[PDB]
């Protein structure tokens, strides 16, 4: 039972990938996966972000 103060680091990679993914953000539900490395407890860094093929289920 312990909690810290975390903060999500956002570079321009994930940002621009979410902007192109937002351009491909059709009303149909879309999927994506974020990557990165966990260095400590209260920090998180994202580097690699890609898109996923759409499906009828969403």
């Amino acid at each position: 039972a312990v909690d810290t103060a975390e903060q999500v680091y956002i570079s321009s990679l994930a940002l621009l990938k979410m902007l192109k993914h937002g351009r491909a953000g059709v009303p149909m539900e879309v999927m994506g996966l974020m990557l990165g490395e966990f260095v400590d407890d209260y920090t998180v860094r994202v580097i690699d972000v890609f898109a996923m093929p759409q499906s009828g289920t969403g």
């Binding site: 059709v26 009303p27 093929p53 499906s55 009828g56 289920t57």
Partner: protein
């Protein structure tokens, strides 16, 4: 054979294509799974000046109009102004088009799979019913021979004669031999309160005959609406009727399911009912004589315990100027009071008892 050794690479590329079509062909099931709503389609050809012009007008069930071109898979019976088409959530594309009904009051007019009675229930009519039995058996199984001889079966047969002769249960008895889907339709059903209903009923009849599997559509009481008047309601029945004749005259692909008709009287004979597709087969069905009435009454009464001492002379004398369904009512009435007569065996007085009972 050194020049033919490059075919192996081509076959490897083709089988590689068959190996790689499983994924992009596999997503067809997850993308084309279920159209969530129903949207009406109206065909409207556009022009772009490939860059070819092709578009269509869409109308959703919620009264919302959108824009989309003609898209989807290979279309053969599509491109018509119909309903019940495939559509996704918001992409509004056409994926699976299937023709739809509604107004079920006309769609479910007479939903009959097959009847019980057969052609072997009557007696003394083979010389005139054999042409119809041929005209329903040979166009169903001998379609192969129709190309060697170049034969197209007629679509309009006029089963006319005095009423009460059984022109409905007998055509249904032959419809049991057709093995196809039987669909009745009444003449007065075309006369409706609202305007333009007869067009929807006729285009509905050719919508289920044209769209559905090979079936059998038998109509009756056509003479009750086939009046050639010179406002008037029978002139509205001339709009709907002449519309049907226009669909039996201007449609060369009408080689599909036949339309069998029967009139209870030929007093008002429409002269425009003469054509290969129209009512050309005019086989006269007169009132059966006492011999023929004893035949159809004997085969229709071969199930009840009838006394063997029947010479048919008394019933042959009592049956004067009668019809088929009248003797059927005499048989049914005999099967009705013969129960309460105590004797389980049918007596001979029950014939005249029924004749004088119902008539």
């Amino acid at each position: 054979k050194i020049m033919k050794s490059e075919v192996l690479r081509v076959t490897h590329e083709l089988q590689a294509m068959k190996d790689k079509i499983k994924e992009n062909s596999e997503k067809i099931k997850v993308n084309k799974t279920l159209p969530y709503l129903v949207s009406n389609v109206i065909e409207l050809l556009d022009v772009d000046p490939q860059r070819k012009g092709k578009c269509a007008v869409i109308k959703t069930s919620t009264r919302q109009t959108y824009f989309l071109p003609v898209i989807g898979l290979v279309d053969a019976e599509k491109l018509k102004p119909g309903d019940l088409v495939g559509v996704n959530k918001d992409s509004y594309l056409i994926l699976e088009t299937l023709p739809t009904e509604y107004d079920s009051r006309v769609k479910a007019m007479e939903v009959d799979e097959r009847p019980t009675e057969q052609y072997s229930d009557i007696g003394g009519l083979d010389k005139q019913i054999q042409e119809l039995v041929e005209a329903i058996v040979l166009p169903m199984n001998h379609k192969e021979k129709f190309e060697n001889l170049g034969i197209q079966p007629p679509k309009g047969v006029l089963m006319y004669g005095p009423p009460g002769t059984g022109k409905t249960l007998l055509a249904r008895a032959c419809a049991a031999q057709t093995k196809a889907t039987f669909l009745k339709l009444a003449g007065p059903q075309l006369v409706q309160m609202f305007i333009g209903d007869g067009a929807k009923l006729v285009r509905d009849a050719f919508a289920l005959a044209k769209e559905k599997a090979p079936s059998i559509i038998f109509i009756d009481e056509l003479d009750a609406i086939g009046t050639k008047r010179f406002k008037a309601g029978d002139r509205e029945v001339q709009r709907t009727m002449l519309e049907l004749l226009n669909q039996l005259d201007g449609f060369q692909p009408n080689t599909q399911v036949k339309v069998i008709a029967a009139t209870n009287r030929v007093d008002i004979l429409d002269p425009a009912l003469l054509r290969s597709g129209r009512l050309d087969r005019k086989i006269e069905f007169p009132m059966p004589n006492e011999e023929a009435r004893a035949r159809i009454m004997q085969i229709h009464s071969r199930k009840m315990n009838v006394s063997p001492d029947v010479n048919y002379e008394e019933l042959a004398r009592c049956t004067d100027d009668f019809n088929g369904a009248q003797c059927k009512a005499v048989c049914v009435e005999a099967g009705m009071i013969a129960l309460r007569r105590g004797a389980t065996e049918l007596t001979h007085e029950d014939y005249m008892e029924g004749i004088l009972e119902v008539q």
